[PDB]
Ligand binder design. Sequence first.
Ligand SMILES: CC[C@H](C)CN(C[C@@H](O)[C@H](Cc1ccccc1)NC(=O)O[C@H]1CO[C@H]2OCC[C@H]21)S(=O)(=O)c1ccc2c(c1)OCO2
Lengths: 99, 99
Amino acid sequence: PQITLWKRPLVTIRIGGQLKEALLDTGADDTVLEEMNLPGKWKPKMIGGIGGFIKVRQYDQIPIEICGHKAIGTVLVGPTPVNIIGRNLLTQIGCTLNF
Amino acid sequence: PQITLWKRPLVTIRIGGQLKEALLDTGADDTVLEEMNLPGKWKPKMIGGIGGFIKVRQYDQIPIEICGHKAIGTVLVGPTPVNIIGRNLLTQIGCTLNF
Ligand SMILES: CC[C@H](C)CN(C[C@@H](O)[C@H](Cc1ccccc1)NC(=O)O[C@H]1CO[C@H]2OCC[C@H]21)S(=O)(=O)c1ccc2c(c1)OCO2
């Protein structure tokens, strides 16, 4: 597909067995999802943005489907205001910026 | 160009006659640049990111050339971790996401 940027590039993703709306975010190195009680082992991490840092839980090798395209990789879970699909998964679903 | 996302999508911009490196950030509504001087009136504004809210200076109708493509629009100056080009200017240069 082609997604214009007149509005926030929000798409439907599936992780665990929840459907969520998430931003396709070229400015995000990593994928950061809103607080959810995901099973499995995790490691603590801090990530920084506008305003400062938040504490997140890093889970590895988590399958996520992004608009019907399969991906699997690291997801960070924490008190973000929005679900963010970062470059780690965007490359996996074949996503490019074009102008 | 077509820009893949295995690396951060950093580009050279020209603003106020100066060259800077900035991040094409589809997850950003607004364009936010690190502390710098720009001419003309600005107004105090606050914006929120992943880590909380910051104070910025809002400059309106500012020319910026992004990777050779002209935009003229709102630029926010403040304590962002990195220069970010957001959707207000990405739309002007005809940037879309494609997968
Ligand atoms: C360091 C470069 C960016 C500022 C990083 N941010 C991704 C942004 O796309 C972020 C994504 C975002 C979007 C909404 C809320 C919070 C975060 N947008 C953002 O802060 O935009 C602000 C400017 O425009 C405004 O519109 C949206 C918020 C404002 S981030 O969310 O803090 C972020 C995401 C994944 C990360 C990360 C930081 O560090 C490692 O992995």
